[PDB]
Design a protein around this ligand. Structure first.
Ligand code: CLA
Ligand code: CLA
Ligand code: CLA
Ligand code: CLA
Ligand code: CLA
Ligand code: CLA
Ligand code: CLA
Ligand code: CLA
Ligand SMILES: CC(C)=CCC/C(C)=C\CC/C(C)=C\CC/C(C)=C\CC/C(C)=C\CC/C(C)=C\CC/C(C)=C\CC/C(C)=C\CC/C(C)=C\CC1=CC(=O)C(C)=C(C)C1=O
Ligand SMILES: CC1=C(/C=C/C(C)=C/C=C/C(C)=C/C=C/C=C(C)/C=C/C=C(C)/C=C/C2=C(C)CCCC2(C)C)C(C)(C)CCC1
Lengths: 226, 176, 421, 37, 246, 105, 137, 38
């Protein structure tokens, strides 16, 4: 279940933690753009091309993330009901350099919004101690421009707005959810894979005692009686 | 390298809040509580004059009855603690149940974290924790320490992702 | 191997042992005093090295000038030697009395030294040792009033050795210290501010010891005393045992919160000293940056530097608000009616005060086994551990175990009287 | 170091103060030679 | 002058908080020597009671002032100032301070248990007296204004750590949540406000001790940079004041 | 269920929004003294005074502070170029603007 | 990867001449630093005045300049406020204030030089850390 | 509340005299199960 086999397909149980740590999706997605882009299309055009389900598989909320106790735990009381786009948020600077945002590791429950350069350089961040801040978003002026699936092919400037996305960027692709239908709390939940695993592994671990109890109790009849 | 393990767990999993580790924590401390009362009760209820010299280094096979009283222990406890199931066979078995029963939980608790499935949150509280800033409980104060553990300890502790965290960015209480 | 318990009744051998371990206690007194004046370097904070007795010796103002390490080296060598030889003078004694032959059958001897279960003789032996403390105590008095003074850390300037005059001998004052709340800053014995109290507080003991030593000498215990206490040999240990425990605690806590007795100049700064020292250090720092100390508003709304105490005075704010009870020679001159005078503060603050703040604040009693100085997180390039933390730490430990001892030996005296033996 | 003329003995003085502990040690050897009783 | 009441004496029952007294001599006498020269001042400030006027049945209210119980004990009082006294072109007296003391008392309102912490301000004060210098105690007057900041400072970090100058910018525990309603709390706001205070002298004396009278001020409660709107307040008490320049 | 007049006003952090006139130069009316240390001999005494005579309407007005020395002026000129001015910000100022700011250590 | 000459080839004066220290010295630098400094200057950061460090860059901006040895030596004898307008001898260790900072009484010219060397070689080794305590903070 | 403080101390010392006088007690003293020495 957890790793995935021919019998553990995708649209049946969802994605794997191994595809998130592997940027397995980001990869295919990229190749669909350098390929089409080089064929005479505009960035706007290329993204608007890559099928969306593909981009969905990329949102982190689809990787068995968190959830020891979250009763109904359907994914939807987490994100909400997803209805969105394969939007790529391009974060450029004041000189036009394309900034790259660092993603959140399925290990952390919370991550620090940070923007890197294409070489690994640090450009923008969201300061905690604003006093001696140097890499603010306002001091360096960032900008978000969406060349993505239909839902959002435009551009943004305000620092309050721009920022929001940075965090929602950290989750990979960006989506919009019909939160209100289930009164989602906005906290992540886990897929049937995690659930099927956590159950079946514990049970199995639990049957180890069962194997050893009944075994010895079988071969020591007289000992049992004492 | 093990202590670091501990801490790691506290920051990303808040393992202490897990109930399973709690029960585990129950048996281990219960194992030691038994080990004391049993061992002390015995030693101290030992039969009088069994040794003229009055030290206690003897026994034998025929010493069927053994060196101490259940009847007195019973009353001792009954009148001091209030309870005392007096039936040697139960006392010892119960001494198997507590420690062992515990570690099985604890182990269960870990099969859970293996899947980043944790007991790291109280929706109820978090919610009212965000809609209101004049409300705080130990539940909260702790969740703060964690992030501190995570921010400062993950870039040196996990070399492969190569975390670069600018001074400002780090969470930090005033003056420290 | 209860070997030491086989000796119980043959008092002829205990003398051999009690006087053998009594020889170690003195041996250590020399081995350590000499080990110290050995490693000891002049003009470096006594406490930044790791000393303990010398500080005691300078406490008695045996060899020092106004809070000046030591002008005269020697005074310590005397102590180092004396005690190291008293260790042989007694090693001989303990050994002999242990190996050459038991006691109790010497007729003229049994007249001078009797045995157990004999209330009148035990009592008598007791009083004896009481006449000795009555003296040693009074000797301390001598060394302050008609002899080479004692070290007063208080008023004025540097408080070098000073001789006392007419100690506080008021009948009331002395026991008042006994009748006061042992809480918040006020610990009965620890509250001792004025060094003169301390002298007079010793005069009364001796008179009380002696007046008592003789008392039991001549008198055997009454009925109530006989029906409350047991009289086994093991039981007298239980009495004496638990007595020492309390005191371990006593002194420990006594150690952490200094009374002039433990001049922080040798021993170091008090746990609170450091904090309060850190507040003051920074008023100045910013005061020099033209910061107005009265209108300061810390993120809490309590003013960074100044706030109040429940009884309404002024005190350095910050967690160091819990140590406003703290009093020393440096922080006091700014003290006045209603608390700290905001006008002496920014106007009348001498420089030598910043020094002490900085030094203490700098040598915070905080340390680890690796002798790492400061916060649990510092780098190993600074070695230090306030003597106080050493005395407080080790000594606490003994006062505890020792109590475990009050329980073990006193519970075994209940087994002698009729229980298990 | 302030012993002046005795300078010569830092050594013995340095390993000196430990002996009180080593006293405990013989005690057990004393026992070993006496079969423990 | 000198009869020393040591800090040793005072630490006992809390006298600091109670301003010094002026008992018998009622000589409002103090000269026009002002017209002749200048004067400075050192003032003690203490209260007797606090008042929170909170009530929300709108359109049907005249005066709703409830008394109050002190949770923060023997704190209030403490106000040790320095201030200069000037004469204006019309014969009135004006006050201007230097140190600016302030305090943080909390009060529990009977009705809801609803605790209310006010920052007791006197900072940036400005004072006034009516007509002339020919009289003082007879006709006592002194009135001016305050400047009232916020109980909390930019550095203050709340339960989930998020304020002005430090602290997160969001509700971390709930990543994919609606930012609208939470906005209120995820952003801190700093308030600076209206101050109003008045004075009445009931005892002036000698040549050294100069004033003492009835206190009475009105400020605003703490709002927590973005929470419930402040409940209004009214404070009353006593005070002490000395003066002398030459 | 809200509007932009309310939301926008609130959706504003006083400190965040200053991140534009700030970060490129030292602000002369508010920044803690320790911001002066990054320039040649400007700290100790001038810092003390520039802070105490605030606020200023034009970066150049520093020169008018009283009791100044000849050289003092000379140095301000060379650095004048690193300063800037902006309206006083209630926050940063009513809380010891000089030392409140985390003593980094 | 060993300690090299270049590493110890430190600036001696304002103009442009340099001296290359030795192994023996370097070590005495630490030993001395720890002796009358570390306590207040642990890892090269002021405990009493956190906004002022001992990093190389910040020393050059002092008055008079201090990115070199002669400057430090001067400072250790007689102190200078970051701008050079106050005499802080009654506050900071100084051979001129031995009478108050007894730890100083013993010191010698050779030792100042070495102490100074320790402070200038360190940063080439530790880097950011010696500054505001990175590993340390 | 001063009325309260007083009430307490009475109560407290009350049960102290019962501890103290319970031990010094000429009557019960130190009476065990195996041997009574009176
Ligand atoms: C193989 C086992 C299994 C698995 C993997 C699932 C999995 C799932 N169920 Mg199903 N379920 C099962 C059996 C199972 N169920 C059974 C037998 C029934 C009864 C017919 C149901 C009834 C059911 C309902 C009614 C619903 C689900 C839902 C769900 C989804 C819930 C997500 C979640 O958050 O769960 C949360 C998991 C937990 C809270 C488990 C916590 C662990 C236990 C309680 C601890 C017990 C403590 C310990 C043992 C006692 C002390 C021991 C002592 C010795 C000391 C998930 C896909 C929901 C759904 O379909 O989503 C839309 C939903 O509404 N399930
Ligand atoms: C006032 C001092 C005092 C005295 C005179 C006695 C005397 C006696 N005790 Mg008691 N005891 C005391 C205090 C005292 N005790 C305290 C404070 C405790 C609580 C811990 C105890 C607990 C105690 C117990 C539990 C027992 C006794 C017993 C006895 C009898 C023991 C004979 C024997 O076999 O010794 C043998 C002693 C030893 C082998 C000593 C072990 C000491 C430890 C391990 C050394 C630690 C040192 C460490 C290595 C140093 C590190 C270096 C440092 C620099 C860091 C003897 C009558 C025994 C008995 O039956 O009583 C009748 C017994 O069982 N005692
Ligand atoms: C606190 C220290 C201490 C002391 C003072 C004693 C003392 C004693 N023990 Mg105990 N013992 C101790 C700790 C101690 N023990 C511990 C920790 C244990 C557990 C290991 C025991 C276990 C034990 C047992 C099992 C027995 C004793 C016995 C005895 C008694 C032996 C008498 C004798 O003549 O031996 C013979 C003497 C010697 C072999 C000589 C030793 C010589 C010393 C080292 C010389 C030092 C040099 C000297 C100072 C030079 C002076 C020169 C001059 C010019 C100054 C004696 C009273 C015995 C007994 O039955 O007593 C009733 C016994 O059987 N003990
Ligand atoms: C007559 C009363 C008497 C007196 C005064 C003492 C006094 C003392 N006892 Mg002793 N004891 C007594 C009776 C007495 N005991 C009896 C009847 C017994 C039962 C046998 C004991 C059993 C006993 C034990 C078991 C122990 C002691 C110990 C001690 C010493 C404890 C430390 C102290 O307080 O130092 C304060 C110091 C002084 C008062 C200084 C005295 C020295 C001065 C300078 C006099 C020198 C005089 C010299 C004889 C001159 C002659 C010179 C020659 C050339 C002519 C102390 C010296 C303990 C010890 O450590 O042994 C030494 C110990 O373990 N005693
Ligand atoms: C804790 C403190 C302390 C205490 C309370 C004692 C207490 C005592 N000591 Mg000790 N002592 C101590 C510390 C202490 N000492 C120390 C530290 C040392 C080492 C410096 C000594 C060294 C010491 C010695 C060397 C002696 C004592 C003796 C005595 C006892 C003297 C009583 C008396 O009246 O003698 C007055 C003396 C006499 C009445 C002597 C009579 C002489 C005998 C009977 C002669 C036998 C010879 C005969 C001709 C043989 C015929 C045989 C045939 C085959 C030919 C007394 C019990 C003495 C003792 O035990 O002997 C009785 C003794 O000689 N002590
Ligand atoms: C009566 C109690 C008593 C008290 C409270 C003190 C207190 C003090 N002494 Mg003094 N001392 C005393 C008796 C006392 N002494 C006696 C009898 C002597 C002669 C042996 C001395 C000799 C002496 C010297 C030589 C020196 C001191 C010094 C000091 C100060 C030391 C700091 C310290 O660590 O204290 C430790 C404090 C304690 C352990 C307190 C114990 C508290 C009480 C008494 C215990 C009550 C329980 C006890 C079991 C009661 C039995 C009664 C029975 C009816 C049941 C301190 C103020 C030093 C100083 O610098 O002062 C000028 C110093 O150099 N003292
Ligand atoms: C060395 C310590 C010491 C010891 C062990 C004893 C032991 C004893 N005394 Mg003695 N006593 C001593 C010193 C000592 N005394 C002194 C110095 C004096 C002079 C004042 C007296 C005066 C004295 C008298 C007048 C009487 C006794 C009696 C008794 C017996 C009382 C039974 C009992 O404890 O009842 C139970 C005990 C209590 C209710 C008291 C508990 C007290 C606490 C633990 C101590 C408080 C100490 C104090 C506050 C500290 C001083 C602090 C300092 C800073 C000033 C007992 C054998 C009686 C006796 O033997 O009758 C013939 C008796 O009538 N004693
Ligand atoms: C050097 C002097 C000194 C000494 C000896 C002590 C000693 C003690 N301190 Mg104090 N302290 C001191 C200085 C000192 N302090 C200073 C300077 C400060 C300033 C900050 C403090 C602040 C302080 C605090 C804040 C506290 C203590 C506490 C304690 C006690 C802890 C042990 C215990 O649990 O007893 C339990 C009790 C006993 C063993 C009783 C002994 C009395 C007789 C023998 C028995 C009476 C029996 C009866 C059942 C009980 C009646 C008690 C009564 C209060 C109702 C101990 C008695 C703690 C405490 O419990 O307060 C009292 C505590 O919380 N201290
Ligand atoms: C309604 C209303 C108002 C009711 C009134 C109630 C009331 C007034 C109650 C007060 C009474 C009182 C002091 C109760 C205490 C009850 C209590 C502490 C129960 C414990 C329950 C519990 C959690 C038990 C298990 C915990 C545990 C691991 C205990 C240690 C094991 C134990 C007791 C061993 C005893 C034992 C040890 C021996 O070694 C030998 C040999 C024998 C024999 C022997 O037994
Ligand atoms: C274990 C035991 C025991 C015990 C023991 C004891 C108790 C011992 C002791 C001992 C002792 C108690 C000892 C002492 C010693 C001492 C010595 C040995 C000393 C020496 C010295 C010297 C040598 C000197 C010094 C010096 C000087 C003075 C000067 C300068 C220089 C010099 C350094 C040289 C007994 C027997 C019981 C039994 C068995 C076991």
């Amino acid at each position: 279940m957890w790793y995935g086999s021919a019998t553990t397909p995708i649209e049946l149980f969802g994605p794997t933690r191994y595809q998130w740590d592997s940027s397995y999706f980001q990869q295919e997605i990229n190749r669909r753009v350098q390929a089409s882009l080089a064929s005479g299309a505009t960035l706007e055009e290329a993204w608007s091309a890559i099928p969306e389900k593909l981009a969905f598989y990329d949102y982190i909320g689809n990787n068995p993330a968190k959830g020891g106790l979250f009763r109904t735990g359907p994914m939807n009381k987490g994100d909400g009901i997803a209805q969105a786009w394969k939007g790529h948020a391009v974060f450029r600077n004041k000189e036009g350099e394309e900034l790259f945002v660092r993603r959140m590791p399925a290990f952390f429950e919370s991550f620090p919004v940070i923007l890197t350069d294409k070489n690994g350089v640090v450009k923008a961040d969201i300061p905690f101690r604003r006093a001696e801040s140097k890499y603010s978003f306002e001091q360096q002026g960032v900008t978000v421009s969406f060349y993505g699936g239909e839902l959002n092919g435009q551009t943004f400037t305000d620092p309050p707005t721009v920022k929001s996305y940075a965090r929602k960027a950290i989750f990979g692709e960006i989506f919009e959810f019909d939160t209100e239908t289930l009164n989602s709390d906005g906290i992540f939940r886990t897929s049937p894979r995690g659930w099927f695993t956590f159950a079946h592994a514990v049970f199995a671990l639990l049957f180890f005692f069962g194997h050893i109890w009944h075994g010895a109790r079988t071969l020591f009849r007289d000992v049992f009686s004492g | 390298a093990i202590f670091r393990f501990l801490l790691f767990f506290q920051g990303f999993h808040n393992w202490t809040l897990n109930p399973f580790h709690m029960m585990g924590v129950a048996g281990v401390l219960g194992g030691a509580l038994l080990c004391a009362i049993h061992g002390a009760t015995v030693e101290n209820t030992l039969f009088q004059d069994g040794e003229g010299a009055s030290t206690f280094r003897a026994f034998n096979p025929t010493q069927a009855e053994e060196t101490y009283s259940m009847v007195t222990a019973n009353r001792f406890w009954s009148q001091i603690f209030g309870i005392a199931f007096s039936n040697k066979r139960w006392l010892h078995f119960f001494m198997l149940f507590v420690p062992v029963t515990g570690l099985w939980m604890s182990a269960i608790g870990v099969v859970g974290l293996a899947l980043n499935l944790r007991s790291y949150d109280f929706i109820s509280q978090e919610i009212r924790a965000a809609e209101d800033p004049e409300f705080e409980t130990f539940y909260t104060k702790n969740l703060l320490l964690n992030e501190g553990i995570r921010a400062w300890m993950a870039p040196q502790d996990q070399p492969h992702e190569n975390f670069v965290f600018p001074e400002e960015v780090l969470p930090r209480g005033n003056a420290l | 191997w209860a070997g030491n318990a086989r000796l119980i009744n043959l008092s002829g051998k205990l003398l051999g042992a009690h006087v053998a371990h009594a020889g170690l206690i003195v041996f250590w007194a020399g081995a350590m005093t000499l080990f110290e004046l050995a490693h000891f370097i002049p003009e470096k904070p006594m406490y930044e090295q790791g000393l303990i007795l010398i500080p005691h010796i300078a406490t008695l103002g045996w060899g020092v000038g106004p809070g000046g390490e030591v002008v005269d080296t020697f005074p310590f060598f005397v102590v180092g030697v004396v005690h190291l030889i008293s260790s042989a003078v007694l090693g001989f004694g303990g050994v002999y009395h242990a190996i050459r032959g038991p006691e109790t059958l010497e007729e003229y001897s049994s007249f001078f030294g009797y045995d157990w279960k004999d209330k009148n003789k035990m009592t008598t032996i007791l009083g004896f040792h009481l006449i000795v403390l009555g003296i040693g105590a009074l000797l301390l008095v001598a060394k302050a009033m008609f002899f080479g003074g004692l070290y007063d850390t208080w008023a004025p300037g540097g408080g070098d050795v000073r001789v006392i005059t007419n100690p506080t001998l008021d009948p009331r004052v002395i026991f008042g210290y006994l009748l006061k709340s042992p809480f918040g800053g006020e610990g009965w014995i620890v509250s001792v501010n004025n060094l003169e109290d301390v002298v007079g507080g010793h005069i009364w003991i001796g008179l009380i010891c002696i007046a008592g030593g003789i008392w039991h000498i001549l008198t055997t215990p009454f009925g109530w005393a006989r029906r409350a206490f047991i009289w086994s040999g093991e039981a007298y240990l239980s009495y004496s045992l638990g007595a020492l425990s309390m005191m371990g605690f006593i002194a420990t806590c006594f150690v952490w919160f200094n009374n002039t007795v433990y001049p922080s100049e040798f021993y170091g700064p008090t746990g609170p000293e450091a904090s309060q020292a850190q507040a003051m250090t920074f008023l100045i720092r910013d005061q020099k940056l033209g910061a107005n100390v009265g209108s300061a508003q810390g993120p809490t709304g309590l003013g960074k530097y100044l706030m109040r105490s429940p009884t309404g005075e002024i005190i350095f704010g910050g967690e160091t608000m819990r140590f406003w009870d703290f009093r020393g020679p440096w922080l006091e001159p700014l003290r006045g009616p209603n608390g700290l005078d905001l006008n002496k503060i920014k106007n009348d603050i001498q420089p030598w005060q910043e020094r002490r703040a900085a030094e203490y604040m700098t040598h915070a009693p905080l340390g680890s086994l690796n002798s790492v100085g400061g916060v649990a997180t510092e780098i190993n390039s600074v070695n230090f551990v306030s003597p106080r933390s050493w005395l407080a730490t080790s000594h606490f430990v003994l006062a505890f175990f020792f109590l475990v001892g009050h329980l073990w030996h006193a519970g075994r005296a209940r087994a002698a009287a009729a229980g298990f033996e | 170091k302030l012993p002046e003329a005795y300078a010569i003995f830092d050594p013995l003085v340095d390993v000196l103060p430990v002996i009180p502990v080593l006293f405990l040690a013989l005690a057990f050897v004393w026992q070993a030679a006496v079969g423990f009783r | 002058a000198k009869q020393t009441l040591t800090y040793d004496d005072i630490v006992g029952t809390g006298l600091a908080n109670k301003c010094p007294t002026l008992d018998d001599t009622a000589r409002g006498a103090y000269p026009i020597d002002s017209s002749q020269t200048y004067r400075i001042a050192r003032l003690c400030l203490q209260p007797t009671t606090f008042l929170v006027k909170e009530e929300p049945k709108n359109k049907r209210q005249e005066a709703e002032f409830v008394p109050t119980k002190l949770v923060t004990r023997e704190t209030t009082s403490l106000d040790q100032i320095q201030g200069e006294l000037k004469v204006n072109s019309d014969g009135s007296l004006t006050f201007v301070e230097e140190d600016g003391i302030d305090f943080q008392p909390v009060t529990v309102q009977m009705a809801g248990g609803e605790r209310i912490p006010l920052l007791f301000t006197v900072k940036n004060l400005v004072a006034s007296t009516q007509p002339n210098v020919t009289s003082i105690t007879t006709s006592t007057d002194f009135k001016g204004e305050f400047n009232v900041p916020s109980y909390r400072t930019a550095n203050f970090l709340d339960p989930k750590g998020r304020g002005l100058a430090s602290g997160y910018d969001s509700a971390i525990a709930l990543p994919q949540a609606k930012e609208e309603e939470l906005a209120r709390a995820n952003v801190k706001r700093f308030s600076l406000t209206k101050g109003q205070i008045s004075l009445n002298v009931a005892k002036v004396d000698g040549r050294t001790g100069e004033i003492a009278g009835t206190f009475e001020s009105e400020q605003l409660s703490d709002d927590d940079m973005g929470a419930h709107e402040p409940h209004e307040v009214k404070i009353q008490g006593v005070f002490y004041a000395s003066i002398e320049p030459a | 269920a809200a509007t932009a007049s309310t939301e926008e006003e609130l959706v504003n952090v006083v400190d965040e929004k200053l991140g534009t006139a700030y970060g490129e130069k030292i602000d002369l009316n508010n920044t803690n003294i320790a911001a002066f240390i990054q320039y040649r001999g400007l700290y100790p005494t001038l810092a003390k005074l520039i802070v105490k005579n605030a606020p200023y309407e034009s970066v150049e007005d520093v020169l008018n502070i009283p009791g100044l020395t000849e050289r003092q002026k000379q140095i301000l000129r060379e650095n004048l170029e690193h300063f800037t001015v902006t309206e006083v910000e209630t926050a940063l100022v009513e809380g010891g603007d000089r030392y409140n700011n985390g003593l980094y250590k | 990867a060993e300690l090299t000459p270049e590493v110890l080839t430190v600036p001696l004066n304002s103009e442009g001449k340099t001296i290359t220290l030795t192994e023996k010295q370097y070590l005495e630098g630490k030993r001395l630093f720890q002796y009358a400094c570390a306590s207040c200057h642990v890892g090269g950061i002021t405990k009493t005045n956190p906004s002022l460090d001992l990093r190389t860059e910040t020393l050059a901006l002092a008055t008079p300049p201090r990115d070199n040895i002669e400057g430090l030596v001067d400072y250790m004898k007689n102190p200078t406020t970051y701008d050079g307008e106050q005499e802080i001898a009654e506050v900071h260790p100084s051979l001129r204030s031995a009478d108050i900072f007894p730890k100083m009484r013993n010191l010698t010219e050779k030792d100042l030089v070495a102490i100074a060397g320790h402070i200038l070689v360190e940063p080439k080794i530790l880097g950011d850390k010696w500054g505001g305590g990175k590993v340390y903070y | 509340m001063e009325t309260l403080k007083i009430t307490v101390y009475i109560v407290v010392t009350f049960f102290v005299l019962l501890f103290v006088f319970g031990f010094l007690s000429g009557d019960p003293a130190r009476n065990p199960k195996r041997k009574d020495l009176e």
